[model samples]
Structure formats: C-alpha cells, structure tokens
Target chain A: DLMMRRGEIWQVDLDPNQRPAVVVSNDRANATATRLGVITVVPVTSNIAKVYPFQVLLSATTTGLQVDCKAQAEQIRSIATERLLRPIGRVSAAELAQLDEALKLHLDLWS
Target chain B: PVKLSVSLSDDDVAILDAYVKRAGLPSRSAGLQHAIRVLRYPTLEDDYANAWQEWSAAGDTDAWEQTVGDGV
Candidate 1:
C-alpha cells in the first residue's frame, strides 16, 4: 500500500535578499529553493521527513502558518509539485476560486 | 479599507529599514510596490505544492508507484 504524504509552502514577509542568511541553518539546507526573491524553504525535521524531490514537508503542527487559507492551499499545492512531482489534480476551477476567496478574506481581515 | 495614519511599531520600522537597505528602493513607495509584487506572484514553491496535491487526488497510483515507489 502506498502512503500518501502532504507538504506545503507559504509566503512570508521575510527579506528577499536575506534569503541566504535564512537558509544557512541545517534545517533549511536540505530541501529549499528560491526564485524571483521568493523563498521556498522547507522544514528539515524528521517528523515530516524532507524526502527526496519533496522539499516543504510539514508536520501537522506546522500547518496554518499563514492566515490566508487560500494562499496556504496554493502553497500546499506548490510544495507538493516540487517535492513529489505531481499535478494539482481534480481541484475544480470553482474550488480554486473558492480558495482564492478564502485567501482574500484573510488578507482583508489582516490588512 | 480606511487609511489610518497610525504609527508603526519598532519591529515594523526595523523591518522596513532592513527592506530598504537590502532592496535599495529609492523611497518607501518603491519598497511598498515591491512588497506588493511579492505577494501577488506565485513562487516556484507554489508550483511544487500544486503538483503534489493534483497527483494525489488523481489517484494515479500506477504513475506514482513508478516514480516514487522504492525499488520495484
């Protein structure tokens, strides 16, 4: 039987140029990549096991770091693709739009 | 959204300061615009997560097994 694992990514207000500083730790070393000033680093702890090809594996406790749920969902989808080489399947456009709406709610709430 | 001209906390000022130093924006407006761009765009990380969830929900075990499975 195949065990399905989940991973996630999130956007933070961390300095884009300071990315090099952030990734210096052992935790950020194993599975991380950045593009266009956006950091996509994952936790290197064993609880989630930053397995090969999968970078941002998160423990249950680590979830919901972002208040924007839709962005978080998108983050989850993005990390899964990089680490697991999978597509964002079966998620209807309407469903994704709903996630966007949820994200907007959080963004508005926070702002 | 109401634009309240409230003061920023020490932490906010520090963060803003660091952003200015590192990013070299001419003014606060430039820095704010850059920050907004970062929020709006999808990073490579986003692509990775989307791929993983899609693959999982698709139930393409055969494909997954081929790539992710241990020595078959």
Candidate 2:
C-alpha cells in the first residue's frame, strides 16, 4: 500500500485543522498548501525544502534565531523586489558579507 | 520512559490553561507542542531587527578599520 511504502510519518508541531500553510520551494519555482490536518506528499522539485532545526526554545529568548532568519529572508526579499522592479541586480558580495557579519554578532549575544 | 507531573506556578498554569482553550487540544502535551512550533518559526522582520540591533550594539565605530584592516 502507498501508506505502507511511505516512511514512518512523524507528527510536526502544526495545527492540522487550521488554514493551509503556504510552503515555498528554495528556488521559488513551486508552492503548495494543504489543510494543516490533511496529509500531503511533498514532492521533490526544483524548489528548496525547509527544515526546522529544533523542538523547542525558551519563548522569551527566541528573538535571536527569529532575527537572523528574518534578515536572511529579507535579503532574499530584496533580491525578489529588485527582480520585480526590473534592472534587477543581485545582492552585492560586499552587502552579503556585511549582513553576514551583522548576523554573527547578534547570534553571539544569543549564545 | 518516564511519566511525571509537576505543579506549576499560577502564572504558568494560567498560560497553560489558555493554550488548552485556544487550540482545543486534548491535553497539555498537544498545546505545548503547538507553542513550541510557533516560537520556532517567527516573522522574518524579527530576525532582521535582531541582527541590526546586534550590529548597532557592537559599537564598532571604526568603520574604516572594518573595511581596510579587518577582512569583513
């Protein structure tokens, strides 16, 4: 059976009953959504897959991780914005290095 | 495996109770899991702000040194 052939399913900390989540691929070429409760097979595609690293963190102290992730996303968003605006230029190496340095410093404080 | 229950402070219990009602979860276990998940995935802005805050905090006034003396 398909279920039997599939690997053991693990429960994610997601509300199965809520509105479907918007899952985007790394390449941004594909996207999908399903009721948090509904089971859907995530296929291998050109898009990037997201992986969560931890099971828990002190709620009050999670700002560090949240902040770094946002900066990374913002960097991506900036690139996307540029593309949308035309004459779209990729993030410069110097800018990326600067952001990286900034992220490391904040991560240090969190540690 | 171990099964145990510990008494919580009034504040903790109140928060736990709120989660129970909000998620309609069967037990404190489920609610706790939900809370953990949300905390793990925060808005991107929060991450950006945190990074910028750290940069601001570093007080590295020598911008020229960072560009020339330091590789970064």
Candidate 3:
C-alpha cells in the first residue's frame, strides 16, 4: 500500500487479460488503503478514437508507460490493493491535474 | 410500461394529492420521480465521519500538522 500513490500506474489483474491502470484517488485515501481495503482506479487503454470529455490522454514520453494511453474516467473502479500485480510507471503532475478535471466531469453528469 | 400496485394511507394520499394538484403534475408517478432525485443529494458527512475515524487512529495528522501549518 505504501508503494501506491495518486497518479501512479500499476498492472492490474482483471478478467481474461491483464491491463494497466492508474490510481485516481487522492493521496489521503491511498494512505488509508489498509483500513479502506481498496483504492479508486481508472483503466488505461490504447483506444483513443472514442474518448470524450471525461477522459485524459497520456503519452509514453510523459508517463513512461509502454504505449500512449487514455485514462477513461467513466470506468473508475475500486479494487483491493492485492489486485495491483506490478508497478508500471506514473503520470506527471501536469497530467494528473488534467485527469482530475475529467474525473470531476464524469461524476458531474450523473449528479 | 411498468405498473406499480401499492397501497397508500388515506392520510398520506391527501397530502400527496395536494402537492399533485398545486404542482399540476400529470400523475403521482411524476412527483415521486422528482422527489427521488431531490432526496438523492449527496451527504458526504457520513463518508467524512468514517474517514476521520480511520485517519485519527493512524495519528498521521498529529505527526505532520505542526510542520505543514507553520507558514503563519
């Protein structure tokens, strides 16, 4: 849990295939991972054509991820820390800030 | 269309009918839907309360508060 932080990426164990994900919850919640039992995450994908306002784009040069990925705010999930299989990389502060807005917008629609 | 079959008290129906008349709603169903959205407003206090309990036990705030707030 100590290794996880907001904006940090991890390889998650999901379904028939594994995929990279980014921690979208704040640092405070992540710090309480032991007590909270889970942290919020956004699934990262290579599909870019379908992106909307509630999504953020990250480049390999910026986040050090293998591919230029889009963080889908619509697919936010809360998963146990053990599901994070490995550390991938992290998004820069600038990229994380943009992501925050997309997350806000995504939730704003339902509200 | 879905149909609902439920009973409401005479006292409750009087109160509900009054609002339905004033608001000029098409049906009781419409009013209930509007009320549902209104009642669903976020109450973050419950979440904050639980979060505070866990954080307080951790004592992370006590350990770092002084240094972080020393700007004054």
Candidate 4:
C-alpha cells in the first residue's frame, strides 16, 4: 500500500466522482492511512474566482492541475484510500505551509 | 485510565463512527490508542523542525552569532 505525502493531489470519488483532493493529514496519519485504508483530505475546485481565506488558490504549474484551482479547506474530509484513484499533482513546501495556516484559521486554533 | 475533553472534526467523527460500529472497538479511546501506536515516530517535518530548535537552544546559535560576521 503506497502512501501520499502532504501537499500531493489525487483524484477521489465523492460523487460527480473523480475530482482532485489535497492530502492535508500530516505524514504520520498518512502512514496510518496505508494500513487502515483511510486518510484525511481537502477537496479541490477549478473555479478560482471568489476565493476566500478558507481556500488556497494554486496555479497549474505548481500542482500539475490542468487549470488553476483552489483547495477547499472548509470541506475537509476523511475517506477510504481506495477512493483515491491516481495522483495528479502536488504542492510545494511554501504552499503546504499556507494550507496549514488556512486549516488553522478554519479550525480556529490560536496557537 | 485518564480522561480529557477534546473535539473532533465532523469528517473524522464520521469515519470514527463507522470504525466503531463496524469493528466493535472498545471505545474511541481504544481506537485512538491504536492510531497512536501506528504513528510510532515523529513526522518528517517534525524531525527537521526539532533539530532546528535543538540547534538554536543548544548554544549553536551563539556560535553563529559570534562567527556570522567575519568582516573580511
């Protein structure tokens, strides 16, 4: 069972099935995802207009996305790894750190 | 044998509910304990971040401060 690191994007089934998702759960839980078959992720969208703090706009070049997209932080989801079809792209360390801040803002973690 | 208050994400609770019902786990506590065991090591970033902290706190920063400006 191969594992995905944080910041990688993969196509997942969530009806309309096969949209990209960003692996937000840290590597430790991701390692568990390999054994338990579940992982936490953030949904992605191509509609980059009307972005908010809860979303991080990513460019196609950075994430192999066909077009610029945004990872929807508020829509965080945990699903079976089997639902993940294949890898499409990944975020950079700076981008992943921005996503972490987005998570902090959404989750309201002051520290 | 200890208890503490905590919060869980809605998505996490959904999976946890599924895990608990399907596996008949003793409780969320046991389930979390299992998850904790699987994560036996610090995450990749944690390793680097901790090393940086150790360097900064173990007088290594003082060495940098002393040698950073050679004036050459």
Candidate 5:
C-alpha cells in the first residue's frame, strides 16, 4: 500500500528487487496519474562510487536510506504504481530541493 | 530551420570560423547553437549550491528529520 507522494522512496519491481526509486513527479500528477496506473520516478542506487553532475547524493541519516545512495537523475522512468512494492523512507525537503535541480539538469530544463 | 543573418567583424568571423573548425561543428550556426547550449548550466549549479547553503544554515535538524515519516 503506497500513497505515492514525491520524495518517498519505494521498492520498484524493475530489475526485480534490486533498485529502489523515489517518486519525483509532482503531487498533482501523482494523484491524477493514479487513474492511469503509472507514476514518474527517479531510481536510486547505493553504488555511490562516482557521483555525476546530474545525480544527487543522499545519506542514510538525512534521507532514511539504508546506505549512502545517489539518486540517478539520468535513469528517471515511469512505471505502474502497482510495480511499487512498498514505501521504505522519505527524503528531506533540502534533499528534495536539490533533486529538483538535478532533474532540471538531467532534463535540460534549466529555467 | 528559419534562416537569419547577422553581420560580424572580420576578426570576429575569423575566431568563430576557427572555433567551428576546431570543434568540428557542422556549420557556423551549429557552433553558435552548441556554445549557447553550453552556456546554460553553470548558473543553475551556482543557484543550487546557494540554496544548499541556505538549507544548511536554517538549522532545525530535528524538524527536518521528522518530515520523513512512515512513508505514505
């Protein structure tokens, strides 16, 4: 059971139990798209070997992640909400704010 | 694509032409387009950095942490 709000991390079925994604779509879109059965998300990975320009670094303490992960902005995708296994944790407002900038950079929508 | 023309000094044209050749851009227009696109992101990076600083200085760690609840 998931409400699918932005900044909330969830276990997605893609790669089958490996990657967790954060809901990056706006709240209004999440609500409206619920009827459509899909939501936009940015995948997060614990492999923080090399942080890129378009990725945001997340911490276990600040983001409630199990490990230090980098939000992969380049790997953003839309998936059926049913693919969301469960809600795990939430990212802080400050981190979400940086994620917003990361999205802008990745999407080339720097306004 | 719409065609437009702009006048440039000889020296300016020489420098732009040299850059176009060096960068292997298809045309002078393509070179300018690439340059304009390249110029777009550094300012955004600066703004993001400043926002992070403000967020860090606001100073209510407990409240911010509490914002993360048992996920919805």
Candidate 6:
C-alpha cells in the first residue's frame, strides 16, 4: 500500500499482539515489491529507563505514540508486510537523521 | 597516539595484574584496553535479552509467523 513509506510508523504483529514499529526499509521496496512480503522495521518501546546511546527517544508529539517511546536501534527486524495493521504516524526528518546515526552505531557501520 | 599516565592504588594494580596474567594479555595497557572494549557490547546484549523476555511473554506466535513472512 502507499501507506508503507519509509519513516512512517505502523502497528505490527510482532512477537507480541501488536506493537509500534518504524518502517526503516527503502521506499522503493515498499512500493514496488509488495509481493516480497517482508520489510525492515525497528521496534518501538515505552520503556525508556534503559535507553542506550544508539536508541532514539520519541515523544507523543513526534511519534503519535500514547506515551514516550524509544526507537530501539538494536531491535531491528524484517517482518511480513501483511502484519502492518495501520499507520500510526511518521517520525520527523530530524529524528530519522538521528536514527541513521543510531543504525550506524548499532550495526558498526562506521567508516 | 597521545600518551597518558594515571596513579592507581596498590590493590587495584594487583587486581589488574592478576587479570592481565590470567587473561594472557600482552601488557597491562593491553589488558586495560581489552577490558574497555569488552565492556561495550554486553549492555546491548543484556538489553536485547531483557526485551526478548518481555516480548516472549506477550508475543503471539501466529502473529509472528504472519508478520515475519519468508523467515528473513
């Protein structure tokens, strides 16, 4: 669906019933390759007490989450697109920029 | 590389010496550097483990299968 753009948050059926996740995969894959049935996403959590340097903190205003959340960089996963329930919101460009840095740290992609 | 120096108590130095010898590290400096490097990844692992536990408790297998798609 056109709704599955990168940086947009969606409710996904992960290990749990349903949780918020940010679409981290490229937009072309999301748009043209819907048959691929899988997309990369990073899980979000309300537990902020143990936020790491590589995780980005998101607010209700920024993420439309009911509460403050952390976009966990280390918890990135690939899941079937069918599990995406609906659009929650989109992260700001600044947050997405920080997420890029966080992903670099999490994946040791330093130059 | 920039050189630096610091004073340590005898007890701390002894402990570090023991670690260095046990770990077969080349030198005290090497041992300390190794220790610092070792300290970085465990926190991320621990956090992942904790998150996994929480997810396991609340996760639905059916949902996971449906969402995980081609096992990638």
lDDT of 1 by residue, A44-95 (tens): 2222222212222222233332121122322221122123322121223453
Model 5 regions lying over 4 Å from their true place: A15-18, B1-72
Candidate 3 per-residue lDDT, tens place, B1-72, comes to: 667887989987787778778888878876665455446534434533543454355432233222222212
Best by lDDT: 6
- Candidate 6 stretches with Cα past 4 Å from truth are B1-72
Reference-based TM-score of each model? 0.23, 0.27, 0.55, 0.57, 0.60, 0.63
Error of 1 at B6 (Å): 4.9
In model 4 chain A, the worst 10-residue window by lDDT is A11-20
Fnat of all models, as shown: 0.00, 0.00, 0.00, 0.00, 0.00, 0.37
- lDDT (CA) for every model shown? 0.33, 0.29, 0.66, 0.68, 0.70, 0.75
TM-score of 5: 0.60
lDDT for model 4 comes to: 0.68
Which portions of model 3 show Cα errors greater than 4 Å? A109-111, B1-72
Off by over 4 Å in 4: B1-72
Measured against the native two-chain assembly using Cα atoms, what DockQ does each of the candidate structures obtain, in the order listed? Answer: 0.03, 0.02, 0.02, 0.01, 0.05, 0.22
Per-model interface RMSD values are 17.5, 21.2, 17.5, 24.9, 12.6, 5.0
Selected candidate, larger lDDT, 2 vs 6: 6
Could you say which candidate leads in DockQ? Answer: 6
Which 10 consecutive residues of model 2 chain B have the lowest summed lDDT?
Answer: B62-71
Better of 3 and 6 by TM-score: 6
